A paper describes a structure:
To investigate the substrate binding mode, GGPP was incubated with OsCyc1D367A before cryo-EM sample preparation. We solved the cryo-EM structure of the OsCyc1D367A mutant in complex with substrate GGPP at a resolution of 4 Å. As exemplified by hexamer protomer B, GGPP harbors a continuous and clear density in the active site. We found that while the overall architecture of OsCyc1D367A is similar to that of wild-type OsCyc1, a number of differences exist around the active site, mainly in the loop near residue N405 and helix α7. In the OsCyc1D367A structure, the α7 helix and loops near residues D192 and N405 embrace GGPP more compactly. In the structure of OsCyc1, K233, N405 and K453 interacts with the pyrophosphate, while M194 and E199 are close to the pyrophosphate of GGPP. In OsCyc1D367A structure, the DXDD motif and the conserved basic amino acid, asparagine (N414), are situated at the terminus of the isoprene tail of GGPP. The distance between the d2-oxygen atom in D365 and the carbon-20 atom in the isoprene tail of GGPP is 2.59 Å. However, in the OsCyc1D367A structure, GGPP adopts a linear conformation, possibly reflecting the stage of binding, which might not represent the cyclization state. When we analyzed the structure of OsCyc1D367A, we found that the isoprene tail of GGPP is surrounded by negative and hydrophobic residues.
The large superfamily of labdane-related diterpenoids is defined by the cyclization of linear geranylgeranyl pyrophosphate (GGPP), catalyzed by copalyl diphosphate synthases (CPSs) to form the basic decalin core, the copalyl diphosphates (CPPs). Here, we used X-ray crystallography and cryo-EM methods to describe different oligomeric structures of a syn-copalyl diphosphate synthase from Oryza sativa (OsCyc1), and provided a cryo-EM structure of OsCyc1D367A mutant in complex with the substrate GGPP. The structure of monomer OsCyc1 consists of an αβγ domain and a catalytic center located between the β and γ domains. OsCyc1 catalyzes GGPP to form syn-CPP, in which new bonds form between C6 and C11, as well as between C10 and C15.
Residue numbers in the entry:
A (entry chain E): 621 to 767
B (entry chain F): 80 to 544, 551 to 767
C (entry chain D): 80 to 767
The structure:
Amino acid sequence: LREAWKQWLMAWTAKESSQESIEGDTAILLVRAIEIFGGRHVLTGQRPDLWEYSQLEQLTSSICCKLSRRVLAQENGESTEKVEEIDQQVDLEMQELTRRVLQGCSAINRLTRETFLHVVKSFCYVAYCSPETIDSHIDKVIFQDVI
Amino acid sequence: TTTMIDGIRTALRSIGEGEISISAYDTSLVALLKRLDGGDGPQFPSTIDWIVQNQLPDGSWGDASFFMMGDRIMSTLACVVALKSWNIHTDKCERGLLFIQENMWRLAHEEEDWMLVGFEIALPSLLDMAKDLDLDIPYDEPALKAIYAERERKLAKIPRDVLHSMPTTLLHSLEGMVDLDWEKLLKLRCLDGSFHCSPASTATAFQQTGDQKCFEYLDGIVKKFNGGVPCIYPLDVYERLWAVDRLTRLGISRHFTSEIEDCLDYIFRNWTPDGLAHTKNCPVKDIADTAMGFRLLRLYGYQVDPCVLKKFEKDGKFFCLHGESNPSSVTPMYNTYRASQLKFPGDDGVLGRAEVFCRSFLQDRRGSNRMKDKWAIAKDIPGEVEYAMDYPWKASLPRIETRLYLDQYGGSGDVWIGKVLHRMTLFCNDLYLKAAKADFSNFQKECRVELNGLRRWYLRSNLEKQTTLMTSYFLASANIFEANRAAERLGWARVALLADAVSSHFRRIGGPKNSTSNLEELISLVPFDDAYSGSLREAWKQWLMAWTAKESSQESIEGDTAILLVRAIEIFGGRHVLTGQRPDLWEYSQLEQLTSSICCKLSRRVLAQENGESTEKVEEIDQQVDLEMQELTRRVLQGCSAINRLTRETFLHVVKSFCYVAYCSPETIDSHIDKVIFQDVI
Amino acid sequence: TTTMIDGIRTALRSIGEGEISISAYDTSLVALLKRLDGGDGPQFPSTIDWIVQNQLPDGSWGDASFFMMGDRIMSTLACVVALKSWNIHTDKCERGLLFIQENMWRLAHEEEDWMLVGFEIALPSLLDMAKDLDLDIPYDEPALKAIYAERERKLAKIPRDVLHSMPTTLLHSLEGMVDLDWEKLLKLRCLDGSFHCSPASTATAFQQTGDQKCFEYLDGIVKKFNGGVPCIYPLDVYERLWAVDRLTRLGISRHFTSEIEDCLDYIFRNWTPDGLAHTKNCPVKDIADTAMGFRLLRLYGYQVDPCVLKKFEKDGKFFCLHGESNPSSVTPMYNTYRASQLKFPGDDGVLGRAEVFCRSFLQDRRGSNRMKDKWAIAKDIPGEVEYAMDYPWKASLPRIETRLYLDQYGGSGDVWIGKVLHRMTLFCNDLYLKAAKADFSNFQKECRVELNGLRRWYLRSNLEKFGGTDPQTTLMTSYFLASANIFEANRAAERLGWARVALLADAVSSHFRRIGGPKNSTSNLEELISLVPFDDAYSGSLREAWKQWLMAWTAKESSQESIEGDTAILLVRAIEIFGGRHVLTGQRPDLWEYSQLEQLTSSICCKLSRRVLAQENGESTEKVEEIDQQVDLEMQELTRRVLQGCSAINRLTRETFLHVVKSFCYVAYCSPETIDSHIDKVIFQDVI
Ligand SMILES: CC(C)=CCC/C(C)=C/CC/C(C)=C/CC/C(C)=C/COP(=O)(O)OP(=O)(O)O
Ligand SMILES: CC(C)=CCC/C(C)=C/CC/C(C)=C/CC/C(C)=C/COP(=O)(O)OP(=O)(O)O
């Protein structure tokens, strides 16, 4: 966790004068922290696992960056077409990610791909809901007693 | 010849305080120091023996291999003022007097931008001390009132109070100074005990007060050379840095990978928070040494911080020294500019100001024929400034640079400018040129053979689904040019060729979904061994999948092509990330992502530039790729990680190849090609 | 290399009744047995068959390599007597008699300490046996009178009474006595059936009595060696002890940790309450085996009591055997002194008097030039004695003693004074020295390589802006003090760790000591621990130790106490981190053992720091001696707690505590020039 936080902070101080958002770095930090807390290494010896992990990380970073850009452009005084463009690109990247994750002939473990999917789905969910529905769901899931 | 390499290595690994020539001025000035006990003549006989031993045919002094004017007349007068003061060998004394009396008319045609150190403060004092003895002087001449005016300007810019509170560059020439008031000035000299490492000034100071440390220094420096005293001593930090520079720029650095480290060690052990001028003693750090040591240390994987360069900042202008009474030269500014490339994102903005101020400076003086420097004399400095200003670090392949420079090294004719004229022996030699030419010819012949060796296979492989073969092989050879890396070079080239072939085929057929044939089997055409049989096939399948997934979108597929080419380089050679950590995974992922992003951005830029849009979008994409390349360059040459060095240099090689492709014109590319791999040398 | 280790392991795993070279005198004295069944030839003809085919080219007998007078005299006289008795092969008797009558004159220059056992009781009787026959030997000699005088001098110490009641060291030479009460003498022999493990005495008693067990012993020892009888037999306890000692003190014992533990079990199973002996079934004991066996049994983690040494006391003056003439015994007193270092505080106080008397005697003998022993010559005894005396148990790193001991080994040049000069083979060999030298060189190579690597790491991290005015000496000292204890091949992750953390501590300490305390500091110091290369298991749990040490620094300011204790605690914790060794604190005794060990280490290091400080300022000797005793008490307690076997902790942890304390205690008992000589001799001085 020390190293992961150091890398995240270095990525902060390395993109201070650019117009690119920094949500991808936070997503990568969350994924690395979950993988560390779980206690699952990755066999870095053979090439296919390395390449699979690199592809997955690049995909989730790009997806989170696109989501951040869409969320920024939404509330601002923009038209209703650029939003559709960004949504189409987001959907293409998401379908590629779910192809890479839900497959069955891969060599990486099962839980790591599901962790990637959980993080990306959490981001995409929190990006697509007004706070009122979030409050309603919070009150209905862990507070509204069932039986 | 390989023996020359071992010879220069043996001469380098036994380095000392630098081997420079001897000056007549200094020998004459130190010869006239008389003894203490009795004193039946001067102190040292070796100096006067060398004086009477090394007369030129014209009767003058100095190195006649380059006929200057000022140094010759100064040395002759300062030598006669002693040869006729001790009243010995009188038959040759006036022989030099005739020379000066017949050639004093040249001081109205000599260059202004080449004036020796302390000239305007050592020539009047020389005339003063020569007044007494029986000898003829042409006192009245405008070329003397001129130097008097320069002396007055120097004394106007440099008051007297500076010579008693802080070290100052004046102490190198203490001859034309009176009423020194050595009470406070004696505790201000250097740590070795000298006076700014100038034997003449130490002799002048010891003549007026009996100090023992200056006596010991003079005795040691005269007994070291066994006859003769150099113009300046020692030179144990300047020589090392400049030798390492002139050695790594020629292209034989890979042979001496041990002595270079054991030579930069002595630089890193003396990185004072102020700087390093020429020794660990002289406390007058200038900006022509730092700009060199900092760049070199940061290039070979060390830990340095450029906040020290801020100490020369004065109102946007940069001082060469503390009291420069002259517009600075080009070599310190040129070195500052060349060291303002390896900037890291977290570094202070001091480099951001140098990168523009020095650019403006070197652009003004380049817009004319005013390219004369002040601290050096070389064959073609404007050409090298042109090269360093036309091609930045982002698109500077090593082979192109070494080829364009190999015909610009001064050999043995590079004189320098101090108090007298002197020549360097370590990094001004002809063995370097011989070894560099031999190695370059070997590489050229190897490439000229392997180019046809590759063209034959290309014609036999039936891949016409042209001219890209020669360019591809030139790009493959301009980076990995070592003797035993053909296995990686051919792999570099073949995968790129097959890739652009399939890329053209997919575009022609109209999509990768209307393809009726199978394509994964195409990898069998490339030669293979048993150890790496399917891994390359796996990478090829991954590239094909990345293509069929990145279709009907906007981002180009060139990034994945760069990543595939990198993995291909990685397969040939067989080195893993076998250590096994979390930082290793993270470093690999970050490097791959940065490479892909930079490649895609350059693809977008080259696509959007041809369209003829406004010139501002180009500036935007350029600033973006610069902000990315800074971080990539930081991660490549940090030298504090656990990844095999070549696996790290591969990414930089590929990214620089792509940047050079995107930042050049085809005709200039072809000129570089047929100048490097077609036109022979010698 | 590695086949030599296999040969040595094979020679060890099949040890038995002992290996020892044959001797001609005993064979001659055995051949004189006339046949039992009534024949004419001797009972054992293999003795003659051997004795006739082993004559030296010179025409003499005895040992070939070495050359001593009494050996040759006795061997040749016995051989000529055994030849003349049966009166066969009489062509060589004159060849031997020539040598005798030509070299008996030179019997006046032999040393006084080198006197064979039973010499003054076997030479006169053999001369009398020769006088019965007509053999012209120079019976007259000024030297022979000294022998007859020494005979009476020894006979005065043992009367005719105690020889028939208590078994003494006299039965080893019996043929040189007559008028024996054989009734009250058959009740004193060994359990095997031989008189004090001696074939000559058994032979003499057989031809003068009608016993049957002695005949069985003689027949067995004759048949086991296919002709020829040895000087003494068996040796089933001597060989084991001295082989284990020569393997331990040579630095090669780690490869044989599965046989040494199976070799010491035989000694532990036969721990006779009044001391050990030179075999399992000898009724007289001595000190050259009790002390050595006790020390060896205690150093490997057994349960032995040292009160058995009380039997060897007589008016505050020890001895080696029950009644002797010349008390010139260097090896027994030396071994007793060396076994007087291991000492628990609750043991009986006899070891104190043992140490005192042995040190007094050895210092007396070292003042003069009488460093000659009566049991065995060697290559260098004074070197061994001076080393074991000048560097006590507290400050004797094993690698140093091994590097020094790779010179004083005898190889094949050793010989032990018994009834005649006889060579031992199982622990006086040539494979031992060669294997030890090879292993030492193989260690030195890795030492040099890792030293270079550590030097590069020290240069790259700009950690020379602190430290003394000569960083190379500090680096060399702090790496030698680490590569001398953990010397194995697969513990680099602990060696280099110790070195790095020691350098960091010694830099931060100087930086703090040149400023004026922790309050006047401004830089971030907690971050210096990141200079150690990153890992997953090792790092991460080390910043805790660093922060605890820094809290210890910032908490001991208003007082005046030292800080070395917390530095030793940091070193032991950081050595425990690497290697990956936990302690199962689930059960309590392990927790309590760990706490006690840590507290003892801290206190000892603080007391040593106080000693060095109060000794530098030039005070009297009383304070220094008091501090020395105060330190030695806790050192004894720590040694007891580390060597014993009660709690259940991984032995390597307690051994790490011992290593750290040994280093911190050794660094304060030597001048810098001496430690520099040691660093130069251990690493750079190459072998073979
Ligand atoms: C800087 C490089 C590449 C090498 C160093 C070579 C050295 C040590 C040169 C001597 C340094 C020194 C004492 C320079 C003197 C600086 C000075 C104020 C000279 C006075 O002359 P200027 O004020 O430059 O004007 P002119 O030299 O044109 O008269
Ligand atoms: C027990 C140790 C340390 C070694 C054993 C090695 C052997 C074979 C020792 C001989 C065993 C033994 C019974 C020796 C006694 C021989 C003897 C002469 C006893 C009486 O005289 P000493 O006083 O021992 O010696 P001197 O005869 O030279 O006076």
